[PDB]
Ligand binder design. Structure first.
Ligand SMILES: O=C(CO)N[C@@H]1O[C@H](CO)[C@@H](O)[C@H](O)[C@H]1O
Length: 810
């Protein structure tokens, strides 16, 4: 059909159909008189999976033979989404499968919609891990994703009467064709017990054992025949577990609860025991696997030459004392040598500066659950603080600030501090974030060890985030510049020489309108809602948080509405305002923001005076597969976090790659995106980080803005008086109270400049040719934000390995 989707050769199409029918018959045990679309999906899934295994076995064989340095990416989250189309894309099978299924009388797109998202992540951090795996395989690194096979991923969001309802994401209900259980590689993980000191060292005894059973998922590189492994651990009770009889058997569930469910918090730390168990579980099982693989190639001096462990946030921070424990207690290395090995092996990526997001585990939890690890942490702390005391003599407050152990009513371990001490590299995820790390929260650590601190600006995989979700745009680009950019996104710069090309302008604008029509159709078909596809698609999709300032978007939306009501017969650029994302189940304010959005939509969407000039849509159940549909359809990307709060953002990059213009603050990766595209091609507004600091020193008085901005006053009056909630007039009193009195994120401070900047958006949209020329300038400069670039930087600057675009034999 289209070039980038690969060849549909007669022989391959014939063979695919053959194997499709084989799987439908032998694997699914169905005749086609009784087969459902789900059966068809599964037959296709198994057919495509067949093409992976050869490459998967040979890739892993190749690594055993060549013994390269191995990269272990430890994450509690891998937000993979669907796997079928991604696998076809990377294997160059998409056209062939499309042809094969068409000839069998099936629509492949329809079959693709049947696959459940692997929703094993909350948002940005989880999706970064997924993009990273793709890029690592594409760059031919011997890389392994290690995590937890959660039985339930991020909850499915239902909206009921404007409120978020959560339901269990039973993603494994119909099975997972992609994974391969490896019950033969089951490993014991120990919890509780106590520490016994013998003549020859400490011993961790009387432990409760939970089994860790690995499930391997293939991670195909882009058309390089490399298939890497994502290994996810499942919790299993041992067979002597609690072994009246019936109850002992039923209580096996307690052990297995460890891998039951993903904690649904984005940028918030909940100090729950089960979460700590999850964290240790993934770490303990992974490290044993790492060491097994290392021995099967006594001298641990070479360990850091053969192993890199990347800690995705502090969640797997226990890797540090666990590695120490194994090296010291089990392998009998001396402390200092073990420490050297640990430090050189481990590296830590920080993903946030929000205090409430930082992991600080109560000492009593670790005391009970992991008594040996606490001992190791204390020892690490003492030796680290001795180094600080020697470098900054007499600086007693520094010692307190830098301690891994934080004092107070409850003593806690600061896991970030642990990570910095036990890692040779610490990185932020955007240049401004990395600078904030060195200047504020980790300033002391930066002063002690400046060489540890790095930047690795985030990226997104252009495979999933252009080729897969936007084939139309991928195609028109490939027509002019060829296919090479898909694994070398910098080549998109070549599109700058087409910014005045009339045919290309027409095509860019055409691909967008097609995406918008297809999405407008998706909304009607699956959610029965009416939207004008000629309107500006103004979208903000991301987790619901106060720092992300969906509320500031809400204020603008209400402003537009009030302006329309004020002058009904005046022309305004029509907008469809789409806001989507999940609120953490216990985050009350975030749940109120969702209610507000739906409440605004209720008023706005049914006001006859408005017509189709303004629509407010809350996109339910925002997730990876929805991101793939709405992002190619967006004209305007809302990236409006208070400066200094969004470590990087990655949704921003996805929108940039797919032909949306960005309205955003100079926060996270927005700064580098503006830098790449040019500030003239970015709708930048609001306080910079420095302005927020100046405001904090002065004191933020929201009332000042309320008093001096009549349009803002009206909105607040409307909210308070019950304009948007006639039956419950005080429903939004919390939101008003928060905005007026305890707004940590200064929504009012950015309101005026935001509304003003939004007017400049509407102005540009009135001129389609110039809008599109600005779009071309964005797409053309989005190259830096490929995760291939990010991963190449990790490889060279942290892991000490060379990426490779060279193919393995097919
Ligand atoms: O999800 C978390 C929790 O620290 N942080 C998010 O990580 C993403 C990937 O690095 C970043 O893009 C987001 O800015 C950050 O909030």
């Amino acid at each position: 059909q289209i070039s980038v989707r690969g060849l549909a050769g007669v022989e391959n199409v014939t063979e695919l159909k053959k194997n499709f029918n084989r799987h439908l018959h032998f694997t699914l045990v169905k005749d086609r008189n009784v087969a459902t679309p789900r059966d068809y999906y599964f037959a296709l899934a198994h057919t495509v999976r067949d093409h992976l295994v050869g490459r998967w076995i040979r890739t892993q064989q190749h690594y055993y033979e060549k013994d390269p340095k191995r990269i272990y990416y430890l994450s509690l989250e891998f937000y993979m989404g669907r796997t079928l189309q991604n696998t076809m894309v990377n294997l160059a099978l998409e056209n062939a499968c499309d042809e094969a299924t068409y000839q069998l009388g099936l629509d492949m797109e329809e079959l693709e919609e049947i696959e459940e998202d692997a929703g094993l992540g909350n948002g940005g951090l989880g999706r970064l891990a997924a993009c990273f795996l793709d890029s690592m395989a594409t760059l031919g690194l011997a890389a392994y994703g290690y995590g937890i096979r959660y039985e339930f991923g991020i909850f499915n969001q239902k909206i009921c009467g404007g409120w978020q309802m959560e339901e269990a994401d039973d993603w494994l209900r119909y099975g997972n064709p992609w994974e391969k259980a490896r019950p033969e590689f089951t490993l014991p993980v120990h919890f509780y017990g106590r520490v016994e000191h013998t003549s020859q060292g400490a011993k961790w005894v009387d432990t409760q054992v939970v089994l860790a059973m690995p499930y391997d998922t293939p991670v195909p590189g882009y058309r390089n025949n490399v298939v890497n492994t994502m290994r996810l651990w499942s919790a299993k009770a041992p067979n002597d577990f609690n072994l009246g009889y019936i109850q002992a058997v039923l209580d096996r569930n307690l052990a297995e609860n460890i891998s039951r469910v993903l904690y649904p918090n984005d940028n918030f730390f909940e100090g729950k025991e089960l979460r700590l168990k999850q964290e240790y579980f993934v770490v303990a099982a992974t490290l044993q696997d790492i060491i097994r693989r290392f021995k099967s190639s006594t001298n641990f001096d070479a360990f850091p030459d053969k192993v890199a462990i990347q800690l995705n946030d502090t969640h797997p921070s226990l890797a540090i004392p666990e590695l120490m424990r194994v090296l010291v207690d089990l392998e009998r290395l001396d402390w200092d040598k073990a420490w050297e090995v640990t430090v050189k092996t481990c590296a830590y990526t920080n993903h946030t500066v929000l205090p409430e997001a930082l992991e600080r585990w109560p000492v009593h939890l670790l005391e009970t659950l992991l008594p040996r690890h606490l001992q190791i942490i204390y020892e690490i702390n003492q030796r680290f603080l001795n180094r600080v005391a020697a470098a900054f003599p007499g600086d007693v407050d520094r010692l307190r600030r830098m301690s891994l152990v934080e004092e107070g009513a409850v003593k806690r371990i600061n896991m970030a501090h642990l990570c910095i001490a036990g890692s040779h590299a610490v990185n932020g995820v955007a240049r401004i974030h990395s600078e904030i790390l060195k200047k504020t929260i980790f300033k002391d650590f930066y002063e002690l060890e400046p060489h540890k601190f790095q930047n690795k600006t985030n990226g997104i995989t252009p495979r999933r985030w252009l080729v897969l979700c936007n084939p139309g745009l991928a195609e028109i680009i490939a027509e002019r510049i060829g296919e090479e950019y898909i694994s070398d996104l910098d080549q998109l710069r070549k599109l700058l020489s087409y910014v005045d090309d009339e045919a290309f302008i027409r095509d860019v604008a055409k691909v967008k309108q097609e995406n918008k029509l297809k999405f407008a159709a998706y909304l009607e078909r699956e959610y029965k809602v009416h939207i004008n596809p000629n309107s500006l698609f103004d979208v903000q999709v991301k987790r619901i948080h106060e720092y992300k300032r969906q509320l500031l978007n809400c204020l603008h939306v209400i402003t537009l509405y009030n302006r329309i009501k004020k002058e009904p017969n005046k022309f305004v650029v029509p907008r469809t305002v789409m806001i989507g994302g999940k609120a953490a189940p216990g985050y009350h304010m975030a749940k109120m923001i969702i209610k507000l959005i739906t409440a605004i939509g209720d008023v706005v969407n049914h006001d006859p005076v408005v017509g189709d000039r303004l629509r407010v849509i809350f996109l339910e159940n925002y997730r990876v597969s929805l991101a793939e549909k709405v992002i190619p359809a967006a004209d305007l990307s809302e990236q409006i976090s208070t400066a200094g709060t969004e470590a990087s953002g990655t949704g921003n990059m996805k929108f940039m790659l797919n032909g949306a213009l960005t309205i955003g603050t100079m926060d996270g990766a927005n700064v580098e995106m503006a830098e790449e595209a040019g500030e003239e091609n970015f709708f930048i507004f609001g306080m910079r980080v420095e302005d927020v600091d100046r405001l904090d020193q002065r004191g933020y008085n929201a009332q000042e803005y309320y008093d001096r901005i009549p349009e803002l006053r009206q909105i607040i009056e409307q909210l308070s008086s019950g304009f948007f909630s006639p039956k419950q007039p005080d429903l939004f009193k919390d939101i008003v109270n928060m905005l007026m009195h305890h707004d940590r994120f200064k929504v009012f401070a950015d309101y005026e400049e935001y509304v003003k900047c939004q007017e400049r958006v509407s102005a540009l949209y009135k001129n389609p040719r110039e809008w599109t020329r600005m779009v071309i300038r964005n797409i053309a400069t989005s190259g830096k934000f490929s995760s291939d670039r990010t991963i190449a930087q990790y490889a060279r600057e942290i892991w000490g390995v060379e990426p490779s675009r060279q193919r393995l034999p097919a």
